[model samples]
Target: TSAVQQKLAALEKSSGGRLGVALIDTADNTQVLYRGDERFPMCSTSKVMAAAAVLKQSETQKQLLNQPVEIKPADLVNYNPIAEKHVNGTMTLAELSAAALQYSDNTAMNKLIAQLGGPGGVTAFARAIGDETFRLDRTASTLNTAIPGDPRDTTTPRAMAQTLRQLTLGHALGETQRAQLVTWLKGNTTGAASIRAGLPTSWTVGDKTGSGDYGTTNDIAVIWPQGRAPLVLVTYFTQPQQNAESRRDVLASAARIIAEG
Candidate 1:
């Protein structure tokens, strides 16, 4: 086995559970797939695609961007750190998108979905981006109540990597829209313990992190290694049942191994 594969094996063993990981070199489309076909709940990582969908819609539907939307008391949901900081009032679509993408605010995600024409808007965007397997059936508010085998948001590691690869190559959005998405992810501070924790300081990384019940921890990122072409890494650590804390450790270990390769 290659060094990265061997290291990933060890990391999975350490987690004592199943894990999915994919490392794709964006320049050449070369990839290392470890359980890449397995599907995983996307959690807030769905916000990455959610933001992209909104941006794509903005190009032809000019009013979608920066349009003000009111935040009612009904719109406020728990588990949203950033939303708690904002008053129960109004914010532009652009600002809400930033809150969702950068901070993983559940309220921001719900509002963005509502503005994007509901959950179907995100699903349509995924199809337009050449990803058919990904699914976003329910809004963030309903994630906890979603039934087994019917997750609110779901994607295989390979599909997640493909979406990022296409976005990085400028296939998914126009230049301006793409820049906005990248900036939001690059500026995100919520995922510092996942892929970012394993990278060297000189490298650039733009990522979205997700944590869900039953030990699901995920991160999808674009990594630009110094003096090399960039790559996309989609890592998922999950089990039929476990705690949330160990997933980050597994992802960090696997990411550092891939980087060192």
Candidate 2:
């Protein structure tokens, strides 16, 4: 309660919007904290859902991990190096997924989105898992123009919390699938200034951050020490993108304070 009140006070005094924070301590099997309702923009953080879909499809269909996928011009979205090189392209689904999470590469994400049946596929999955608050109503094409720099993703804080919980508890997939996901997420993280901030050097955090050309900035992560259960943390904050330093500090500071708490 003290931490929540302190953060809330700071947020009110600053220039920000729709601030939300959710944390779970697996060490004690408790929901450490929560704030805000669902219904918020997802941005590239949508890739986490995409990751689950890929793993589920692989397990159910017994799909090959290195399945050859031909990346055509139509598959090209943003961050298309091969397309920019004026050459046709081809790569594996796994590679595209890796790039999507590791680099927040848009072209890679669009290909994965198309592969898993587009926005409808991801949205249906979320709803099937009892996430009515989150709806993937926009596609890469639509998203490209919906907002500045086309960062057209949406979700609620509650939905995100549920998704992370499911991901952690193996609700998204089976035992073997969950193990694989843990291994992949440990390496697929993008933004660390927030979720990974202020952790002990021995701890490991698996997370992803989403941002757009606008002020949209957010992070979702699982922080844990070795041989210990993890905690889930979700936070979203926004400020002028031009003020990159301030924006980054906001996220890092939030994590640092949370660590102290």
Candidate 3:
């Protein structure tokens, strides 16, 4: 087996739940790891697509980035920090995009969804961007609440990684807009203990994280090794009954192995 496969086998041996991973180097199109293609809940990682929808609307609909969105009582959310702070005010579309990605703020994401029209708009944006296996059927209000039988928002590991690649390097958005989106992600602190923790000090990562009950942990990122082109890494641990810390460590180990190569 290859080094990545060896590492993947090790990860599988150590993991107690379903795991899916996709790693690709943008510089040379090298796929270092691709373990599974099954669909998994995206959780807050859907914010990336929502933000992209907002940016795309700015171009296609002539919606200005500075367009203001009134934060009403309906927009307030108890599910995330940015909304839980509950400062009543208006935020621009750009501000909402940044807050949602950087902080994984559910309320901010809802506002972006509203700006984009609805969940349909976000899903449409995903399809437009070529994330064929992505879907968003609900808003942030139901976040972390397990649907009896249906997973509302979901994507395959490969699709999520491809989405990141297109967002960062494909023509999904203009250079300036893409730069802004990436900047917000680079400032993300939500998954600091997961994939980012596994990287070398000299490297930089722009990523989004998703977590849910039952130890569902997911992170998709653009990792820049010093002096090299950026790479995309997407990982998901679905219904991991294992403790959160253990799942995170397993994720970090997988990331470290990939980064080492």
Candidate 4:
């Protein structure tokens, strides 16, 4: 079997279920690894799409990065933002986007996604960009799209991994947009406490993480120093009974193994 397949088999054995993953090299269009090519609920990791889509809007409108947007009490979702913060309930578009990327602020993302013209706009944008399984279901109501009777937001290890490649290669957006995309991702504040905990301080990482009580946990990211080709890493865990601490360890172990290879 190929190296990637062997790794996948090992991952399944370790996780005790479908432990899908994918890796890519943008500089050469090389698919470094792939597992579980079909859709898997991405949990909060779908926010990466929201991040890209909102930036797309900014590019089209030549948006002011520092533009201040009033956050109404109703705009925020109570489920995230850790609930301990956001008591003031107001932030700029830049602040909201930063909060969403850095803190994985679901409240901030819901507000920003709504301002991005809702789920219809985001889904249409993803399809135009060619992410076949990219979607937003009823659970993401903050985006204002219908449930469509389809499964919740799902993404395969393949497409999500490809996204890192596309971003790094500037295929998904224009050059300026790509730079902005990198900037947004580099500032990701969430999931660092987990999936990235295993990496060295010298390593550069750009990633987003997702977790939901509905049985999903995942991390998608790119890593490597500037001179070398970046390595894409995507890991998904969908065990209902698994605790957050264990999933974090799983993601860390999986990513470290791939990088060391």
Candidate 1, residues 42-99, lDDT tens digits: the string is: 8788898888888887888877777888877777876677666666667888988999
Tell me which residue pairs clash in candidate 4: 102-189
TM-score of each: 0.93, 0.84, 0.91, 0.84
> CA lDDT of each candidate?
0.81, 0.65, 0.78, 0.67
Ten contiguous residues minimizing lDDT sum, candidate 2: 143-152
1 or 3, which is superior by lDDT?
1
The root-mean-square deviation over C-alpha atoms between each candidate and the true structure, in angstroms, is 1.9, 3.5, 2.3, 3.7
Reference-based lDDT, residue 176, model 1: 85
Q: What tens digits encode model 4's per-residue C-alpha lDDT throughout 198-231?
A: 5666788888887664345678887875577767
Give the TM-score ranking, best first.
1, 3, 4, 2
Give the C-alpha miss distance for residue 80 in model 1, angstroms. Answer: 2.4
- The 10-residue segment of model 1 with minimum total lDDT is 143-152
Off by over 4 Å in 4: 82-89, 139-150, 198-200, 240-246
Please identify which of the two predictions, 2 or 3, would achieve the higher lDDT against the true structure: 3
Best prediction by lDDT = 1
Which runs of model 2 end up more than 4 angstroms from their true locations?
32-34, 81-87, 141-152, 226-228, 240-246
What candidate 1 gets wrong by more than 4 Å, as runs, is 144-152, 242-246
- Measured on C-alpha atoms, candidate 1 has an lDDT of 0.81
